[PDB]
Design an enzyme around this catalytic site. Structure first.
Site, PDB file in Angstrom:
ATOM      1  N   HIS A  74       0.892  -2.472   2.570  1.00  0.00           N
ATOM      2  CA  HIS A  74       1.738  -3.284   3.553  1.00  0.00           C
ATOM      3  C   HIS A  74       1.849  -4.627   3.068  1.00  0.00           C
ATOM      4  O   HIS A  74       1.288  -5.124   1.958  1.00  0.00           O
ATOM      5  CB  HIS A  74       1.029  -2.785   4.772  1.00  0.00           C
ATOM      6  CG  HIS A  74      -0.357  -3.586   5.110  1.00  0.00           C
ATOM      7  ND1 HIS A  74      -1.393  -2.852   4.768  1.00  0.00           N
ATOM      8  CD2 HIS A  74      -0.648  -4.882   5.628  1.00  0.00           C
ATOM      9  CE1 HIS A  74      -2.317  -3.689   5.157  1.00  0.00           C
ATOM     10  NE2 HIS A  74      -1.900  -4.813   5.406  1.00  0.00           N
ATOM     11  N   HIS A  76       1.032  -7.586   4.085  1.00  0.00           N
ATOM     12  CA  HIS A  76       0.118  -8.772   4.503  1.00  0.00           C
ATOM     13  C   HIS A  76      -0.403  -9.487   3.456  1.00  0.00           C
ATOM     14  O   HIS A  76      -0.825  -8.678   2.325  1.00  0.00           O
ATOM     15  CB  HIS A  76      -1.086  -8.130   5.376  1.00  0.00           C
ATOM     16  CG  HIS A  76      -0.950  -8.106   6.977  1.00  0.00           C
ATOM     17  ND1 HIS A  76      -1.756  -7.589   7.647  1.00  0.00           N
ATOM     18  CD2 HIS A  76       0.061  -9.247   7.613  1.00  0.00           C
ATOM     19  CE1 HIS A  76      -1.336  -7.986   8.859  1.00  0.00           C
ATOM     20  NE2 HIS A  76      -0.537  -8.821   9.056  1.00  0.00           N
ATOM     21  N   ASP A  78      -3.497 -10.245   2.178  1.00  0.00           N
ATOM     22  CA  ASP A  78      -4.312  -9.552   1.427  1.00  0.00           C
ATOM     23  C   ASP A  78      -3.928  -8.329   0.482  1.00  0.00           C
ATOM     24  O   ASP A  78      -4.785  -7.616  -0.330  1.00  0.00           O
ATOM     25  CB  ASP A  78      -5.497  -9.183   2.162  1.00  0.00           C
ATOM     26  CG  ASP A  78      -5.135  -8.689   3.450  1.00  0.00           C
ATOM     27  OD1 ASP A  78      -4.226  -9.042   4.190  1.00  0.00           O
ATOM     28  OD2 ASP A  78      -5.744  -7.458   4.184  1.00  0.00           O
ATOM     29  N   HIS A 137      -1.614  -0.347  11.917  1.00  0.00           N
ATOM     30  CA  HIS A 137      -2.072  -1.715  11.700  1.00  0.00           C
ATOM     31  C   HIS A 137      -0.970  -2.822  11.578  1.00  0.00           C
ATOM     32  O   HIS A 137      -1.106  -3.890  11.970  1.00  0.00           O
ATOM     33  CB  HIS A 137      -2.960  -1.546  10.584  1.00  0.00           C
ATOM     34  CG  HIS A 137      -3.215  -2.883   9.896  1.00  0.00           C
ATOM     35  ND1 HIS A 137      -4.164  -3.848  10.376  1.00  0.00           N
ATOM     36  CD2 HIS A 137      -2.837  -3.416   8.892  1.00  0.00           C
ATOM     37  CE1 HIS A 137      -4.287  -5.053   9.677  1.00  0.00           C
ATOM     38  NE2 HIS A 137      -3.693  -4.676   8.646  1.00  0.00           N
ATOM     39  N   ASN A 168      -7.992  -7.308  12.727  1.00  0.00           N
ATOM     40  CA  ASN A 168      -6.280  -8.075  12.950  1.00  0.00           C
ATOM     41  C   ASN A 168      -5.350  -7.258  13.752  1.00  0.00           C
ATOM     42  O   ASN A 168      -4.514  -6.668  13.069  1.00  0.00           O
ATOM     43  CB  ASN A 168      -5.974  -8.839  11.783  1.00  0.00           C
ATOM     44  CG  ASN A 168      -4.755  -9.664  11.969  1.00  0.00           C
ATOM     45  OD1 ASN A 168      -4.793 -10.058  13.142  1.00  0.00           O
ATOM     46  ND2 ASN A 168      -3.953  -9.757  10.977  1.00  0.00           N
TER      47      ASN A 168
HETATM   48 ZN   LIG Z   1      -3.087  -5.938   6.889  1.00  0.00          ZN
END
Ligand SMILES: [Zn+2]
Length: 215
Positions: A74, A76, A78, A137, A168
């Site tokens: 994904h 994000h 990280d 998520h 999160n």
């Molecule tokens: Zn994430």
């Protein structure tokens, strides 16, 4: 079989002959390293360019092969954070169109946007399926399936046993997340191992856990 590095920041542990887990601290974060006969393939790189470089460097040296490919599960920070490292070394960064558009919208360099809902890649001997099960998520989260190993990288969609809550949820769809998890359970009815985005490798049970965290 934990091969750590210089700093303990990076660490890999074997799942089998050809599949290792990588974990970097930034909160520890998992991905896979696939030793295929055509190069190394990472499911997910790392938090940032620094740790992505250290990771590539550590696997290339150990396995004596180049990282040729990464699968970004994904958009994000990280998961996409070392994207600049990948593109500039000529490492193919596979992602869905949606992950890429999210990467772009968040100011990142774009991965390939080549993965569909179901995509079947082959790297040397190694078969990899990518699966978009729906939102969870994040809206864009995908899982990765190694059909020769029945190994699922659930990424952040999947919470380790030690995760006591959802982490999160700023970008989460806690209402669609259960269905998306269910979509994974239906597609992959016999799972040998599941790799959560953070935490210790488990089985089918991590998906049941995650379902429960969602009640
Ligand atoms: Zn994430």
């Amino acid at each position: 079989t934990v091969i750590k590095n210089e700093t303990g920041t990076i660490s890999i542990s074997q799942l089998n002959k050809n599949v290792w887990v990588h974990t970097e601290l930034g909160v520890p974060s998992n991905g896979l390293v696939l030793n295929t006969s055509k190069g190394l393939v990472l499911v997910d790189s790392s938090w940032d360019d620094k740790l992505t470089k250290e990771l590539i460097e550590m696997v290339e040296k150990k396995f004596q092969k180049r990282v040729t490919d990464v699968i970004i599960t994904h958009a994000h920070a990280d998961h996409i954070g070392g994207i600049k490292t990948l593109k500039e070394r000529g490492i193919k960064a596979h992602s869905t169109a949606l992950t890429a558009e999210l990467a772009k919208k968040n100011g990142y360099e774009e991965p390939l946007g080549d993965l569909q809902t179901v995509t079947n890649l082959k790297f040397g001997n190694m078969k990899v399926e990518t699966f978009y099960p729906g939102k969870g998520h994040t809206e864009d989260n995908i899982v990765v399936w190694l059909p020769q190993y029945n190994i699922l990288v659930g990424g952040d969609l999947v919470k380790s046993t030690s995760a006591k809550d959802l982490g999160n949820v700023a970008d989460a769809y806690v209402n669609e997340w259960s269905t998306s998890i269910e979509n994974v359970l239906k597609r992959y009815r016999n799972i040998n191992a599941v790799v959560p985005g953070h935490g210790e490798v488990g089985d089918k049970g991590l998906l049941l856990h995650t379902l429960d965290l969602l009640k």
